[PDB]
Amino acid sequence: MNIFEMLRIDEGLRLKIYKDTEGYYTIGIGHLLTKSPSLNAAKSELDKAIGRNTNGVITKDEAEKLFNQDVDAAVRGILRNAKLKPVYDSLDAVRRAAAINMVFQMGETGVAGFTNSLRMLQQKRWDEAAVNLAKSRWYNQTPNRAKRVITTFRTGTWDAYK
Ligand SMILES: [Cl-]
Numbered sequence: 001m002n003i004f005e006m007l008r009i010d011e012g013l014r015l016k017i018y019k020d021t022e023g024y025y026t027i028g029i030g031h032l033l034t035k036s037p038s039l040n041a042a043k044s045e046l047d048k049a050i051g052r053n054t055n056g057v058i059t060k061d062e063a064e065k066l067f068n069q070d071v072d073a074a075v076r077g078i079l080r081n082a083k084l085k086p087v088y089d090s091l092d093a094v095r096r097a098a099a100i101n102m103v104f105q106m107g108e109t110g111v112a113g114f115t116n117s118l119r120m121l122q123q124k125r126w127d128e129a130a131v132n133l134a135k136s137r138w139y140n141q142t143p144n145r146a147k148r149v150i151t152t153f154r155t156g157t158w159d160a161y162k
Pocket of ligand 1: 144
């Protein structure tokens with residue numbers, strides 16, 4: 001197990017434009033296209049992302065390319081963030097993957113509300129962190145995925161995915 005396999009499980013793979021859990025146009029392995037209700041706006045973003053006129057459909061390779069970029073950007077974003085970086089650096093590799101997962105799903109702006117969970121994570125208060133993480137819109141809206149990510153933070157193992 002690794003961050004790619006983990007996010008692949010959580011996000012799935014769809015080669016045609018679909019709406020994510022929040023109703024937003026998305027493609028591939030959870031690549032958010034736009035929050036705009038306009039399918040045409042989404043198709044435009046897709047074309048921009050892929051570099052060709054896609055007409056809302058991409059290949060597996062193209063999906064994986066976006067995925068690689070998205071994971072890369074997610075981790076880089078964490079390290080570029082003065083508040084997130086120290087927490088990330090304090091973690092072991094398994095929990096780092098859980099961190100990337102959350103950033104991938106929400107963005108750093110979504111992560112901003114998790115300040116208290118982050119503190120407990122840096123403190124390595126795993127059970128407490130886990131409890132605090134679940135007190136969130138995130139958990140309530142995507143409980144199955146949240147439970148997996150939280151278990152990963154609680155245990156530092158891949159048990160929730162293996
Ligand atoms: Cl599920």
